[model samples]
Target: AQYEDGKQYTTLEKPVAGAPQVLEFFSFFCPHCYQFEEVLHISDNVKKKLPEGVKMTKYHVNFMGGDLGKDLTQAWAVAMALGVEDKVTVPLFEGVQKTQTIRSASDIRDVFINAGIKGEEYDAAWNSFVVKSLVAQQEKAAADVQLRGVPAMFVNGKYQLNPQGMDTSNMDVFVQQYADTVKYLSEK
Candidate 1:
């Protein structure tokens, strides 16, 4: 029920100006979203073919209050706040899914520190504008869209992608198709 009009809707309400080609709405704790990383390479190989003006930005979705979700959300906000979002997102993703350790606030914080973000900076960001905004924004995203699951995606404020009841075998293809759909709409 989070998506209507055959498009993914976000709780942000207003569209960002100079909208990019695609905005991938997601949550860090989402196993599917995490799994999407295996086959989806992020290097220039992944970047070169993107359509002009088709920028992909990740939106961190959070509804749970536990440390795992909070830490992930906080990490996202800290990176963005420190102007390191583009640099750290991939690494953070890798850290979360690659290691066997459980996800939590400290785990995420340690990852941040390893990524060159100091604890104080992390704390500040965890309590700062960007992270706070992200928390509130995610809540609104859930409420406004009636979200019921993680790994859901919103495309250009119009399309949505969710894995509920779908076979997991086709995840990669499904994501690709969804991206293609957004790209088509963006160009139109």
Candidate 2:
């Protein structure tokens, strides 16, 4: 697929350095994001297809600005800071989207506790100043990119992948195209 400059993805005014970054902007409460998570997490082939030297991270969107969004975003930041993202990421999504159990920070903490995270560890990471700082940084990054929705992509912090321009009818195709676009941008 040939990617257009203004449509498939837009270039950022200030791009991040080091290896190209493939940032997935999502929200725990978003149904679309929940569906996309399957493609993101379960597809080992797609995960393997990512080129070497390309760094990827999932950023929780703060667009909703409600307690749900804010608390979950903070929870995600804490997970990242505590290095428990791989352990708690999916469970958090399941709690919110599937079970409808996660509603507040306390609820999120319970999710962590159930995930085998000790109370002390969960508390330290959840209330840490570093987690708060990271949350602020992620919020600013979302704003900087002018993110309008979840399940969005930013390659190297320079190119914003256009999911809307993709073939929505076939998510398999859409994910392929998304991966192809990221691979293409990373090579540049």
Candidate closest to the true structure, highest TM-score = 2
lDDT digits (tens) for residues 1-188 of candidate 1: 32233343223445444433454556655566666544453222224445686666555765543567666776776776788776666666666666645456787777778778889988887888767887676566555545576555554554454334233366455455445444444554
TM-score result, candidate 2:
0.86
RMSD (Å) per prediction: 5.5, 2.5
Model 2's alpha-carbon lDDT is 0.76
Evaluate residue 106 in candidate 1 and report its C-alpha lDDT on the 0 to 100 scale.
Answer: 80
lDDT of each: 0.58, 0.76
Off by over 4 Å in 1: 1-21, 41-50, 162-176
Q: Against the hidden true structure, what lDDT does model 1 obtain? A: 0.58
Best by lDDT: 2
Model 1 deviation from the true structure expressed as Cα RMSD, one decimal place: 5.5
- Screening candidate 1 with a backbone cut-off below 3 angstroms (N, C-alpha, C), the clashing residue pairs are 7-158, 7-159, 8-158, 8-159, 8-160
Query: How high is each candidate's TM-score?
Result: 0.68, 0.86
- List runs of model 2 lying over 4 Å from the truth: 13-20, 39-46
